[PDB]
Amino acid sequence: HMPLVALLDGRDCTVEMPILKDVATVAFCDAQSTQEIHEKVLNEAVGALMYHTITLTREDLEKFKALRIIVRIGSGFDNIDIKSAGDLGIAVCNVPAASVEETADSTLCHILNLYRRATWLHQALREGTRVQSVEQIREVASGAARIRGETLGIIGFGRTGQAVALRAKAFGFNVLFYDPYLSDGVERALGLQRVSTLQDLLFHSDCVTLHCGLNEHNHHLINDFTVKQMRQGAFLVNTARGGLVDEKALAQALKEGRIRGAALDVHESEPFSFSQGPLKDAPNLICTPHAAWYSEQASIEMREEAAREIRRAITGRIPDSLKNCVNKDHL
Amino acid sequence: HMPLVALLDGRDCTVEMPILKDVATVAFCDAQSTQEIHEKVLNEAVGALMYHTITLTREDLEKFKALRIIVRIGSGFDNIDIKSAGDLGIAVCNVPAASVEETADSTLCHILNLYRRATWLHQALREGTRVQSVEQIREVASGAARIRGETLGIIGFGRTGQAVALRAKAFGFNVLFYDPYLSDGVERALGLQRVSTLQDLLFHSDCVTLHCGLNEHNHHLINDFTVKQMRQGAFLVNTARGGLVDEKALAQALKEGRIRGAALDVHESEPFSFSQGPLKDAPNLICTPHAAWYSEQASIEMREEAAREIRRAITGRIPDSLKNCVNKDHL
Amino acid sequence: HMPLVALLDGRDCTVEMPILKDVATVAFCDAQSTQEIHEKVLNEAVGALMYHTITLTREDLEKFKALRIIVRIGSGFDNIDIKSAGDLGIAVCNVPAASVEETADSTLCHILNLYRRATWLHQALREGTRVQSVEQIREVASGAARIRGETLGIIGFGRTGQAVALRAKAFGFNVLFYDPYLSDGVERALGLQRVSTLQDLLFHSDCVTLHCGLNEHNHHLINDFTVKQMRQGAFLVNTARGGLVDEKALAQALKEGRIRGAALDVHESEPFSFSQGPLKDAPNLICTPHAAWYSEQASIEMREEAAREIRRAITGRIPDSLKNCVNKDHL
Amino acid sequence: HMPLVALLDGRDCTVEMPILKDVATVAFCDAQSTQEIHEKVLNEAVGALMYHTITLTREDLEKFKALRIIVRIGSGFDNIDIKSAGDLGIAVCNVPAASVEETADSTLCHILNLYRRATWLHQALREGTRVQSVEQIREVASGAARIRGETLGIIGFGRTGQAVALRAKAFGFNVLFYDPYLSDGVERALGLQRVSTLQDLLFHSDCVTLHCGLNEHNHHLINDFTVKQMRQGAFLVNTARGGLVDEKALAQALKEGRIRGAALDVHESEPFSFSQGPLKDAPNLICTPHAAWYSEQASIEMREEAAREIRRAITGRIPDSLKNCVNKDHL
Ligand SMILES: Nc1ncnc2c1ncn2[C@@H]1O[C@H](COP(=O)(O)O)[C@@H](O)[C@H]1O
Ligand SMILES: Nc1ncnc2c1ncn2[C@@H]1O[C@H](COP(=O)(O)O)[C@@H](O)[C@H]1O
Ligand SMILES: Nc1ncnc2c1ncn2[C@@H]1O[C@H](COP(=O)(O)O)[C@@H](O)[C@H]1O
Ligand SMILES: Nc1ncnc2c1ncn2[C@@H]1O[C@H](COP(=O)(O)O)[C@@H](O)[C@H]1O
Ligand SMILES: [Ca+2]
Ligand SMILES: [Ca+2]
Ligand SMILES: [Ca+2]
Ligand SMILES: [Ca+2]
């Protein structure tokens, strides 16, 4: 009788089971919350696989009586109290590399959608707008702007942020980044300008894109205060984490025109709806349902890697055998 | 009393008049056809400014009794019989450089919109789709594909085509082009692979993008025959000219899935409508109303350049003074 | 009995003969001048292969009594009177693509050799210089300069020039070019700045590199006059043609320090010697013996292509069958 | 009376003193070894500035009776026992960013010097070689190779390594790297392939370039064993640290042709001489006297930064105030 591993917030384990067949019994819960988890898993689950639709607090984690590893199928782990998980003796891991370029591609797509208004232009044709003269073109496409010379400010200069920068350079962007945790000179290897503070980044950027994890020190990084530091008519793009932005502040900025447009793949409350929330009636808003990460090859890659990480934890020694443990310090 | 210059298919001459004030009387016609042009212009117009919403055949041009220059405010001139215009002693000019990067940016936006489905994903949220689980994400975003390793086939390797290639390289595309008029070795300077025939390009390309003018030899370049030469599930993008594609052929390819998606800024009949035409009910279609060229700075640049070209023709010697005459041979 | 083809200024025909065996008798002359060509070739040679070490004037070409094609094994043809050759009914062809990237790589090597002084630094160690302290390093390497922010001015924006630009961009150069024959907007497709005149290019460039053919209108393009228009302490690089530079002017500029250094793969009189010529005692000079074009694969590629061009001329119709005829107008 | 700071292995403190004037007395020793340091500095020196020409062992550091900070004017600190320095309560710092791009430029210069033989070709002309025929060009330039398609293997994917990769991509290199300390996915952000082991890197690379620090685990990383794992006729470039290569092994590889050429800015014993050492008579060797880092702007930048770091240590709290302390763990 092998250890039990549970896919907490999902139903499909097809990609994982060929890797774990002779290692662990695999069950799933399709649970949005811990309340919806059968007590068989809580008391006996040795490992857990998990996406982004369930959050595990210290109280949620204290209900598990035998869990020793949690593997987030994906890069971000802000939905898990990793320090409490470490206190309780539970290793938390992630899969960081699978969707780096997918997300950067989705990001560039949203950046170009703002500067070129292709998505809004398509809606206008879906809604029946007639664009016959060169002069109706200019009106319907009003706001489309030349990209060369514009300044793109990247918050978070890690893997995805650097992929964004590389792509942005080819379109003629002047690319800056702000990352207060990187060592001196990372800007030089890649031929970019770096700034010391968020205020400087927002001050100089016509378009601000977010590419940092959500941690204890940057909740609502974009807030009513820091939004006033953004250039008039600036763009905001967020394919990182919804909790990084105060949507109430953003909603007002868009309504008053202080921000000309925003493209958001993530939101404070998901799933997102154009009928519920602070952006209920905000203008110049493009939204995708947390899909910037998804490609068929990326989805398979991350699930196979996560399954292997579970295998390494069961058959090996924690945390030495793990390749992407994110709470070694708290463990 | 100065020579008369007429903005044929438009109303706004504000950008042009400061340049032409002391050179020519400036009138406009706001005419979609030659039938709608007041006979005062036909008999006395010495020069003409024109966009893409009116076509001038040999018969249309023979109605002008004093015209000696036509300046297309824009790069393409397929809407003017340039060889007959030259026969009749009328120089035809264009403005090629103003929207090179704007169009390449719109093109990359449409390419990424197909590979990432951001525009379709936004529609699904506008239509009320609920995307709660990781598993509804995969379904709603089904078709989104990893770009690295994919092959982008560029038809037409001129200014816009080369800007497309440069940008595409940064996303990991394998970029080929087909241009049967360029000299030997242009592929080498830019680090790209070139193919000899359209069939080869379509054979190897997962995504085909068009960046050639519409001339007498490539009407319906993409037709029922050449569409069968495209890879199964390939992408098509067209920000060049609508006449290059047989939409009846494309409509069927999209319906049967031989082409997974198409992004079109231009169409056989403009203005485009999702309710009229061969693509009335075609799936996986993204459309923009011939706006890939438009930025505020590009629109001003092209109009000022065209006004200067008109000035050079009136005050100087034709065709020696013109900087962008496109029918010197037929003149 | 087949037509005779002669390798005029060489001995080795090994690469060409498998292609021409059943098409033409192949002889060689190893001749630096026409005076050294056996009269059998002059009177009967139907085709000719040729490198850069022999020049054919109208008088040289009038000695051939049956020649109908000349194929330059290489890109440049300034050593052939192509217009007189056309008058006499002789097609002249070249092979332009084989060494585009080789030359751009040699160019970047010479550019970096000037900015980094690696070649001069190696000489100093060959001559026995002792570099022990950080302070002898600065002295021996005195002149080495930071590249980011420097301006590279490209004269000639064709295949090699554009390959130079692409590479130069990655090192942080600000790249301009001057090419008075290209159409409007070529700078935009590639994300570069263009200037109208040679004076402007030389005015703004810290390092000037030449990548244009030698034609009737740019002999001694760099002369005593235009050298005074160069920035103080500027760099000059020439991998194009020696006839483009007045070496007497350059020698003085280097001696007086108006030019800090020059890297030359070509020269007014070849073969080059550090003991003969106007640069006999010029300082800060790096020289290579007209080898910027050479790689093993490039040398084979060009010779096979040239052999095929000869084959096409003998077995087909001139000039219709030729792929790289450079005097179709004069023919 | 202020604290004393000593430039140990140098004489020039001009750039540093305006920053330290009112903070510390500044003396210099111009010492290649600790034996040559006046005892006034040993007993009273509170801080130390230092380049790469003196090494400080535990025994050297134990002679200082009041030293509390050492600042290496430069990136590498392999010449300082940092762990013993930390044991003795001495913070060790460096200046990492000043010469990132200078070194990458020197590296690319040496890489191109090998592939293009420009430096060797210039020597041949200095030695009087006559290169008249196309056929003497091929012989004298024999070995010059086409770069597109070649594989560049980077050992060490930090700041300089990544700058090397970016530049190398533009020349057509296929760039791999090996860095066993970086997290999963760094290769993806930058569009490169990564390998797990040194053997794999050496196996696939036509040209191997070193860009890692010298630490306790990679002395003689390139040794007689690992040299046999290099591809036949491969290139080696080293602008990092001389101690990374067994020159006896390299000397033999070059003599037998297993390595076609090597470009070395650093060496096991410096200063380097072509008359002393294991490479006394090694062929196909290019050498520079540890100058890859030097530009005028880089030299000033690093000295001002180091002076500021000394100022921060004297006027602030160690190690909290330091911006580039490299032994916080051992302190
Ligand atoms: N508040 C913040 N502001 C800017 N950058 C941040 C912040 N928090 C984290 N980061 C950076 O975001 C990056 C995440 O990269 P990755 O997780 O590899 O995509 C890291 O370089 C972090 O240092
Ligand atoms: N039928 C065709 N197929 C491929 N390329 C074409 C065709 N017709 C024209 N072109 C090319 O399209 C390019 C137009 O570039 P531009 O007008 O500068 O954007 C030129 O390089 C033409 O040679
Ligand atoms: N005097 C000149 N100044 C600047 N560019 C020139 C000059 N003469 C020729 N060229 C350009 O040099 C380029 C040669 O390119 P290629 O022969 O393809 O390497 C062409 O673009 C020419 O227009
Ligand atoms: N033995 C080694 N093999 C490969 N990479 C190494 C080795 N030792 C250190 N490195 C890497 O070298 C890089 C140094 O970068 P930097 O000091 O920023 O130029 C870091 O990424 C290290 O992980
Ligand atoms: Ca703006
Ligand atoms: Ca596909
Ligand atoms: Ca200078
Ligand atoms: Ca080789």
Author numbering:
A (entry chain A), B (entry chain A), C (entry chain A), D (entry chain A): 26 to 356
Question: From the publication, what sentences describe this entry?
Answer:
C-terminal binding proteins (CtBPs) are cotranscriptional factors that play key roles in cell fate. CtBP1 and CtBP2 regulate cellular processes through binding transcription factors and recruiting chromatin remodeling enzymes such as histone deacetylases, methyl transferases, and demethylases to targeted promoters. Although assembly of CtBP has primarily been considered in terms of dimers, there is accumulating evidence that NAD(H) binding triggers the assembly of two CtBP dimers to form tetrameric dimers of dimers.
Five residues with different amino acid identity between CtBP1 and CtBP2 have atoms within 5 Å of NADH. One particularly interesting mutant, V185T, enhanced tetramerization in the presence of AMP. This ordered water molecule stabilizes a cluster of water molecules in the vicinity of bound AMP, which apparently stabilizes bound AMP over that in wild-type CtBP1.
